[PDB]
């Protein structure tokens, strides 16, 4: 009974076990099922070309067919029509609309703004807002590598540097989660990582980080690591480079990135480590050690030389990253600088439900009576612990604290409502956002957060999720966690990172985007309609599961190869 073993092994996070059990099998269709599981988990394992069905197992692992099945389900629902931003309802509102359009139309390669000629929209934006506008094209064309690049290529030759940087970022985005074997992204992006213009460096490096977040490629890391030591690199470029390297090397314990990050910290003046882009350096370090637990002491000891104010931040962030999956009661006691502390409480507690409910009570207490500075991060922790999970109590709390006189609590509460409801058409939440949009009219920043939350609620027109867990809520996608942490750590300085120049980091959410649709196949990977009983009623598949539902097929005619009816399942005959 092979399929269970590979689940348990993937939980153990051990490469050797994964490859040991993914072979040592006398069936092929079971290997195809395990390949679908690995593809969902974002693990790609290299196989010898002499294995019995190398071509198809490789084709499955690289999610090449994901786009076609997703568009097939989009044809079943009859939802291919584009939704302009005004249907959901200054430069800052053009940018807000661009983001709404990108979120809503994600994974359908259609749009009414970025038409055949997108200059008409791009030149209504300016500077970084125009960069993120150009970057949104790659979010609309997600997982469509061939058509994505065919559409993006026109902007790669623009005279405007912001548009070219956004096209580079789009080219990176369209390569996320697909791992095609021709390497279009390394060939297209790698010439700009040391470009003279820093905006080009930011776009190329973030694109490469998103395109290769799955695997710790040695060539991409050797390309990128020099850029943190370049004397022309801004602190923003060094931070983005550390983010990219930690995403690419996430959970790998790669020593050369670790040493490079420590060297880049040790070089920086006590005056520069005050720059808030410096917070991305230990974030990349934690991503490099995410979930490795007690092994982190060696680096905690190496960090002892760092300046005292920065030391608290680096140590806390790296420690809570190392234990992100642990669900350790004692580290939670230690955490019970402060913002990263509460984010680490959520990051650790999300691994089990009793700890998560105690965390929810703690976060409510902190929002009501906590330190005035400490409560600023609490809504982001509430977002992290309950992404794509529209709990009524959480949404009520955030709606209460959505008017708070302290602007950052309001901003973070609104963003947390948008995240919690992401990928769900919840009508209560949509009405809340519409009312808060009427209240926060004539308030550009709160209105911007409201528009972001509105767009995020309708992400994919209801067909996408951001939850990091999958397969019966028992396996954690490290790339999803890395993207979510990138965004929320950037939101611990929302007024200067997100509302400033660097809102392009919101596109890190693409690393966590996944489909929430069930699909059944015959042993030939051919769409096989069956009837299912989705509980916690009947429908004709492919059907959409919500956060906590279990789907069962209501006849004994077919038997599934995997015990878990999540994602893609191959079905045998009697």
């Amino acid at each position: 009974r092979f399929p269970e073993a590979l689940r348990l092994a993937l939980m153990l996070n051990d490469m050797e076990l994964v490859e040991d059990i993914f072979t040592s099998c006398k069936d092929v269709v079971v290997q195809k099922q395990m390949a679908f599981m690995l593809g969902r988990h974002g693990v790609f394992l290299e196989l010898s070309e002499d294995v019995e069905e190398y071509e198809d197992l490789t084709e499955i692992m690289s999610n090449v067919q994901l786009n076609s099945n997703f568009l097939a389900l989009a044809r079943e629902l009859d939802i291919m029509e584009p939704k302009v931003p005004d249907d959901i309802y200054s430069a800052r509102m053009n940018l807000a609309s661009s983001f709404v359009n990108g979120f809503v139309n994600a994974a359908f390669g259609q749009d009414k703004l970025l038409t055949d000629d997108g200059n008409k929209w791009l030149y209504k934006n300016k500077d970084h807002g125009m960069l993120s506008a150009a970057a949104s094209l790659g979010m609309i064309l997600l997982w469509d590598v061939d058509g994505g690049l065919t559409q993006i290529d026109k902007y790669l030759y623009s005279s405007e540097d912001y548009i070219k940087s956004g096209a580079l970022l789009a080219c990176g985005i369209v390569n996320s989660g697909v791992r095609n074997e021709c390497d279009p992204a390394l060939a297209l992006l790698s010439d700009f990582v040391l470009h003279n213009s820093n905006t080009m460096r930011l776009g190329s490096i973030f694109g490469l980080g998103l395109a290769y977040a799955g695997s710790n490629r040695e060539d991409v890391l050797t390309l990128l690591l020099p850029v943190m030591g370049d004397s022309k690199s801004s602190m923003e470029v060094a931070g983005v480079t550390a983010l990219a390297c930690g995403m690419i090397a996430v959970g790998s314990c790669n020593g050369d990135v670790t040493s490079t990050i420590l060297q880049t910290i040790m070089e920086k003046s006590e005056t520069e480590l005050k720059d808030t882009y410096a917070r991305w350096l230990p974030l990349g370090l934690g991503l490099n050690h995410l979930g490795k637990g007690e092994a982190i002491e060696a680096i905690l000891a190496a960090l002892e030389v760092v300046s005292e104010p920065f030391r608290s931040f680096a140590n806390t962030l790296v420690d809570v990253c190392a234990y992100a999956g642990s669900g350790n009661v004692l580290k939670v006691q230690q955490l019970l600088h402060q913002g990263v502390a509460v984010l680490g409480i959520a990051l650790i507690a999300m691994g089990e439900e009793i700890g998560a409910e105690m965390a929810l009570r703690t976060f409510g207490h902190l929002l009501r009576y906590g330190e005035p500075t400490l409560r600023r991060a609490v809504p982001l922790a509430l977002a992290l612990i309950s992404v794509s999970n529209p709990r009524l109590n959480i949404l009520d709390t955030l709606s209460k604290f959505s008017h708070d006189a302290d602007p950052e609590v309001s901003y973070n509460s609104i963003f947390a409502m948008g995240m919690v409801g992401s990928g769900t058409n919840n009508a209560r939440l949509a009405a809340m956002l519409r009312q808060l949009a009427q209240y926060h009219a004539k308030d550009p920043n709160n209105l911007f957060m409201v528009r972001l939350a509105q767009g995020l609620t309708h992400l994919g027109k209801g067909t996408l999720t951001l939850c990091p867990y999958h397969s019966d809520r028992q396996l954690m996608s490290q790339v999803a966690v890395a993207g979510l942490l990138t965004v929320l750590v950037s939101f611990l300085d929302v007024r200067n990172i997100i509302l400033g120049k660097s809102h392009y980091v919101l596109y890190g959410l693409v690393a966590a985007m996944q489909p929430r649709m069930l699909v059944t196949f015959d042993e030939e990977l051919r769409p096989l309609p069956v009837s299912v009983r989705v509980g916690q009623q009947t429908h004709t598949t492919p059907v959409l599961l919500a956060h906590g539902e279990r789907a069962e097929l209501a006849t004994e005619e077919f038997l599934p190869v995997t015990p878990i009816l999540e994602g893609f399942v191959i079905l045998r005959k009697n």
């Binding site: 060939a187 790698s190 700009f192």
Partner: peptide, 18 residues
């Protein structure tokens, strides 16, 4: 060049297009 095409070796300068 780590950024070129020879199509695609198994089926040009991308930046310059020379």
């Amino acid at each position: 060049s780590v950024s070129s095409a020879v199509y695609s070796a198994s089926s040009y300068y991308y930046s310059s297009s020379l």
